[PDB]
């Protein structure tokens, strides 16, 4: 879906598979979090499903030793003195030692502050221990987490349950038309994108000798030239849009290892999983009830939450017993209007627009010379039209899909392109969709705060700040304290401070709250990027402080208060809202659960080969399932006729469904259902 998603995929730790265990074989002990996972395997990253605890992600600083165990870096402490010498320890080896937590205070030389410090011990037991007895210490506070988990700002503020989702979900984010780096970060956003391999990094230092949208050439110092070709509008495995753009301008001096061109969900070489949105924490006329989400039409009019999605369609021409399938622009009984968008071959032309039902590749096959209908024989003598022995086997556009035809790939057996035995011409037609965000699309933040878009109001209906700026996204206050994930709140605060900027007061000295705050943050510009590394970063004190430092807007007025809230005007009534609303900026991702994919319905369609019931799935245009549980719901009601009808003429009564269709189109009454062909099958299976 996005570079991170792939990156995490390479670092999954599955217990499933041959030689491993089954999903039913696994009890509750295998799945829950073990003490030895510390620094080796994340305790947060794991699937929500029935696969829970059987799949995990490898921790950030972890590595695998030649014997297939998982080592982890620790700092060596000689005698109360931290040494920069680092040794990797396996699980059972760390058990024979005693480790100090990373955040334990250390002398400028390297000595501990207090005699008794926080200490990790075998069996996940913890006790205070004299500094004489400290063997090692953790490399980093974020040492236990995974790559994905470390991208969750204020993680220590979110209960594991939502935090878990918040990690699982980032890998579900869809690449937008162009991407912004989050106003709030953790630092991990950089290294994750580079290592992901879906950006472009320069091998050797040099200077950009030539730049184009197509490729980047770099003149090395030694004289050699390495050109990097850009991936442009390519279909991922999941139909998201892997498109790379050049960062550097021509004649830029660039060093090795630097990001010269970033890809999907990457802004200036950082993971840009989403957009920075102006949030407002309030119930708004019910349209955000039960975790639904309200959007400003700005996000639709400015493509802010808009993505590209590429599909690939295939069709081939085989040798049949009645001849061979041939791909041609001559299709039986079709106007020159439907064929208007094809070429002379029978293929659609590049750049043309396609809707569902339309023809992509005109293929015809010879039909079996069976005796045509005596009623259609007669219909062919009147109009004197002789029938063709070729039946339409064309590749039409699947329901739901639509877009612009962005590329044709033709293979022929004639042009010596080596095909599988039996195939002649093989065509692929690629269609891209510029899907703007719509109702029902699932948005999420990094804190397991998910939800589909409820209503997209006109930009004027949106509650707005005093200076006229309409908020972007209206989240429901109700669904925040329940989920224990006030990380979304803290991010919103630090989000606003980063949008407006700030300045601590240095007159009468440096204030006692911002005493621990690094010098570099005492003064901050509008739209400034920051880092809140997990188990470090902003503390609630500093955050409260920064809310007072907030710089005024262009009109010289401060917008939000020290509480972090602000006054809104209901864009509908005009009257101001009675109570100050928590406003600020929050990073939001567009997950790959969009209605354009998820919606589906069927009247009649294809049917099962044996049970003669409908087929299943959107891909097969199948019907829904009315399960054992669902039938109980019918019986409980006592809706005997409804229940029957669904299990009979709506399902596997061979003769019934046909006659129900007739009865409907002729506008008559629905007939009495017959015998379920499935039941017939059963008696033959018993016999």
């Amino acid at each position: 879906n996005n570079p991170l998603s792939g990156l995490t995929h390479k670092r999954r730790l599955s217990a499933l598979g041959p030689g491993g265990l089954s999903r039913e074989r696994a009890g509750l002990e295998v799945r829950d979090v073990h003490p030895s996972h510390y620094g080796r395997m994340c305790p947060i990253e794991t699937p929500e499903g029935p696969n829970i605890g059987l799949i995990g992600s490898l921790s950030v600083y972890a590595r695998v030793n030649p014997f297939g165990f998982i080592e982890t870096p620790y700092r060596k402490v000689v005698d109360g003195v931290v040494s920069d010498e680092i040794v990797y320890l396996t699980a059972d080896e760390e058990d024979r030692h005693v480790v100090a937590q990373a955040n334990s205070p250390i002398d400028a030389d390297g000595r501990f502050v207090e005699p008794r410090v926080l200490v990790r011990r075998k069996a996940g037991e913890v006790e205070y221990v004299p500094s004489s007895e400290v063997d090692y210490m953790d490399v980093s506070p974020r040492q236990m987490v995974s790559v994905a988990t470390a991208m969750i700002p204020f993680l220590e503020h979110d209960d594991a349950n939502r935090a878990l989702m918040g990690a699982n979900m980032q890998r579900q984010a869809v690449p937008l038309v162009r991407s912004e780096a989050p106003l709030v970060g953790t630092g991990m956003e950089l290294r994750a994108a580079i290592d992901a391999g879906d950006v472009v990094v320069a091998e050797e230092s040099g200077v950009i000798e030539e730049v184009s949208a197509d490729y980047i050439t770099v003149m090395h110092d030694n004289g050699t030239r390495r050109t990097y070709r850009m991936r442009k509008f390519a279909r991922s495995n999941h139909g998201t849009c892997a498109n790379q753009c050049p960062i550097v301008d021509a004649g830029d001096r660039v060093e090795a290892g630097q990001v010269i061109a970033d890809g999907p969900c990457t802004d200036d070489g950082e993971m840009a999983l989403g957009k920075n949105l102006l949030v407002a924490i309030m119930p708004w006329e019910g349209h955000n009830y039960e975790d639904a989400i309200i959007l400003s039409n700005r996000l639709v009019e400015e493509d802010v939450l808009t993505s590209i999605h590429i599909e690939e369609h295939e069709i081939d021409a085989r040798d049949t017993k009645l001849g061979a399938e041939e791909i041609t622009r001559d299709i039986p009984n079709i106007s020159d209007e439907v064929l208007a968008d094809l070429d002379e071959r029978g293929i659609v032309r590049i750049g043309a627009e396609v809707r569902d039902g339309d023809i992509l590749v005109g293929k015809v096959t010879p039909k079996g010379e069976t005796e045509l209908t005596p009623e259609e024989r007669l219909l062919r003598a009147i109009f004197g039209e002789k029938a063709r022995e070729v039946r339409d086997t064309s590749l039409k556009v699947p329901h739901g899909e639509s877009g612009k035809v962005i590329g044709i790939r033709v293979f022929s057996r004639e042009d010596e392109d080596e095909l599988p035995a039996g195939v002649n011409e093989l065509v692929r037609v690629y269609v891209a969709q510029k899907r703007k965000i719509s109702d029902g699309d699932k948005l999420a933040g990094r804190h397991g705060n998910k939800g589909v878009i409820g209503k997209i109001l006109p930009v004027e209906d949106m509650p707005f700040l005093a200076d006229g700026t309409p908020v972007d996204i209206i989240l429901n206050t109700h669904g925040v304290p329940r989920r224990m994930n006030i990380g979304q709140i803290l991010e919103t605060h630090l989000g606003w401070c980063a949008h407006s900027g700030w300045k601590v007061d240095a007159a009468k000295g440096v204030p006692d709250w911002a005493a621990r705050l690094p010098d570099e943050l005492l003064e901050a510009q509008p739209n400034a990027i920051v880092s809140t590394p997990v188990f470090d970063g902003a503390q609630e004190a500093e955050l409260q402080g920064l809310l007072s430092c907030t710089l005024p807007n262009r009109d010289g007025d401060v917008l939000v208060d020290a509480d972090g809230k602000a006054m809104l005007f209901d864009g509908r009534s005009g009257e101001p809202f009675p109570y100050p609303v928590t406003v600020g900026y929050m990073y939001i991702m567009k997950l790959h659960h969009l209605v354009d994919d998820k919606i589906h319905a069927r009247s009649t369609g294809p049917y099962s080969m044996i049970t003669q019931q409908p087929l299943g799935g959107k891909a097969q245009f199948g019907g829904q399932r009315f399960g054992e549980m669902e039938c109980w719901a019918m019986q409980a009601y006592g809706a005997a006729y409804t229940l029957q009808e669904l299990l009979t003429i709506k399902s596997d009564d061979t003769v019934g469904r046909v006659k129900v269709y007739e009865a409907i189109v002729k506008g008559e009454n629905i007939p009495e259902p017959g015998i379920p062909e499935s039941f017939k099958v059963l008696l033959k299976e018993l016999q």
Binding site: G187, L190, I194, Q258, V259, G269, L517, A528, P533
Partner: peptide, 23 residues
């Protein structure tokens, strides 16, 4: 600054100094 190693944008970090080893 956080990762002053590649040539990357400056993202200012609230922190206790983390110099053991890069990711």
């Amino acid at each position: 600054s956080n990762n002053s190693v590649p040539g990357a944008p400056n993202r200012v970090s609230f922190a206790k100094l983390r110099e053991p080893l890069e990711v």
